[PDB]
Amino acid sequence: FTMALDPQAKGLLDAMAANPAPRIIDLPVKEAREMYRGIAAQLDLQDLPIGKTEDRKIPGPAGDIPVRIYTPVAAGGAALPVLVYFHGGGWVIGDLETHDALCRSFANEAGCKVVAVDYRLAPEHRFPAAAEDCLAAVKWVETNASEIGVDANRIAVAGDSAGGNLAAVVSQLALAAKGPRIAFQLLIYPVTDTNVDTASYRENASGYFLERDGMIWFFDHYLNGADRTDPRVAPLRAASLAGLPRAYVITAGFDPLKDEGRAYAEALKAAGVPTEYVNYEGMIHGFFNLQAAFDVSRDAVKAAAKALKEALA
């Protein structure tokens, strides 16, 4: 295991190295968001089928929140379990389009409705705007479960990266508020803390798509000298994890976020929370949205979806 890096990942990274265009993090957010959209468009699966896709607005604490509601192909009329999904992108980039293929994948493979949330992004809306919107969305899904044909006893949350941060944080806030009821949290290479100097941060600092300098950039847009020890951005620092939703936690081997993701999984287990932890040793951060490029990505998305399905049975 000289480097256990997946050869499809090495191929991708080498190709990205040969590109002279500015890094996402050297750019104003307009270009950064567009650059990320273009990346997504080329490396994720296109033209996946869906039973139904519906865009609408729901009431939010600061104004309307756009959401996208996915129904599995050939779903019956019965009320379905529902996954509320928070996209990644360091709380700055990403949107309903960048993660659409992943949402379709979860809907079809897990057999659940998916509600993807277009939450407020930084720097236009700093912390805790994203968490406010994501919590509001889960509350709305629970309250209006009958209207959108879902089972309010089978609500899961999920997200990748900053979205996984939000899923973890929303779970904590919901527990503290005694609602909404969340039955599962699917944390895909999540941000769980604000220490950019863990062993995996320094070992995987550059060259693996998500870089240490990238996280610094994201944190600076998102956190406004906000307390970086605030558990609403650093859920690993919570006083207690007891009573949180059963979890499925994914980390990538060459991800600077590996150590804190694993740490959160360990701390959930130690607090008695049922937790399934899987690490993909050859993968890089962001690989759940690279299903067109990586064989392992398709396998991992299916595996996460099946865990979700089985948990909400």
Residue labelled with tokens 């949205």: 289
Query: CA 3, CA 17: separation in Å to the nearest integer?
Result: 18
Known catalytic membership, residue 255: yes
CB 54 within 8 A of CB 95: no
Active-site option among 99, 100, 285, 297: 285
Report the alpha-carbon distance of residue 227 to residue 204 in Å, rounded. 26
CB atoms within 10 A of CB 255: 26
Neighbours of 226 (CB within 10 A): 15
Compute the residue count for the chain: 313
Amino acid identity of residue 23, one-letter, is: R
Instruction: Give me the helices (H) in 248-294, please.
Output: 258-270
Cα-Cα-Cα-Cα torsion 46, 115, 280, 274, nearest 10 degrees, comes to -160
180: preceding bond cis by omega (within 30 degrees): yes
Task: Tell me how many degrees the CA angle 71-72-77 measures, rounded to the nearest 5.
Answer: 70
CA gap 202, 175 in Å, rounded: 33
Cβ burial, residue 109 (10 Å; 0-12/13-18/19+)? middle
Q: Would you call 133 a catalytic residue per the annotation? A: no
Counts of helices then strands in the chain (DSSP H, E): 10, 8
221 is catalytic: no
Residue of 161, 171, 200, 297 with catalytic role: 161
Q: Give the SS3 label for residue 294.
A: coil
Phi-psi region of 158 (alpha: psi -120 to 50; beta: other; left: phi over 0): beta
Please answer whether residues 96 and 118 qualify as being in contact, where contact means their C-beta atoms are separated by less than 8 angstroms: yes
Distance CA 188, CA 88 (A): 9
User: Residues of 265-293 as b/e, b for ≥16 C-beta within 10 angstroms?
Assistant: bebbbeeebebbbebbebbbbbbbbbbeb
Contact between 268 and 185 under an 8 Å Cβ cutoff? The reply is no
158: helix, strand or coil = strand
| Dihedral sign, Cα of residue 93, residue 98, residue 104, residue 106 | negative
Six token digits for residue 89: 């992108």
Sign (positive/negative) of CA torsion 118, 207, 41, 5?
A: negative
Cα-based distances in Å from 274 to 236, 270, 277, 311: 16, 9, 10, 11
Q: Give backbone dihedrals phi and psi of 30, rounded to 5 degrees, phi first.
A: -60, -55
Report strand pairing: 65-71 vs 113-117: antiparallel
Q: What is the spatial distance between Cα 101 and Cα 98, in angstroms, rounded to a whole number?
A: 8
CB 113 within 8 A of CB 142: no
- Could you give the count of Cα atoms lying within 13 Å of 46 in the half-sphere of its Cβ? 7
Q: Which CATH number characterizes residue 171's domain?
A: 3.40.50.1820
Check: CB of residue 65 under 8 Å from CB of residue 136.
Answer: yes
Write the single-letter amino acid at 145: A
The answer to whether residues 116 and 53 touch, using CB atoms and an 8 Å cutoff, is no
Distance, in Å, from the CA atom of 148 to the CA atom of 203, rounded to the nearest integer, reads 45
Confirm if 70 and 116 have CB atoms less than 8 A apart.
yes
Tell me which of 44, 255, 259, 297 is the catalytic residue: 255
Cα distance between residue 271 and residue 290, in whole Å? 33
Q: Are 70 and 103 in contact (CB under 8 A)?
A: yes
The total number of structural domains that make up the chain: 1
Locate 51 and state its tokens: 């039973």
- Name the 3-class secondary structure at 109: helix
- Let me know: does 232 contact 133? Beta carbons within 8 Å: no
Question: Which two three-digit tokens encode residue 303?
Answer: 């595996």
Amino acid at 15: A
Q: How far apart are CA 106 and CA 309, in angstroms?
A: 9
Question: 144-158: buried (b, 16+ CB within 10 Å) or exposed (e) per residue?
Answer: ebeebebbbebbbbb
Q: What is the resolution of this structure in A?
A: 1.9
**Domain, as residue range, for 196:** 1-313
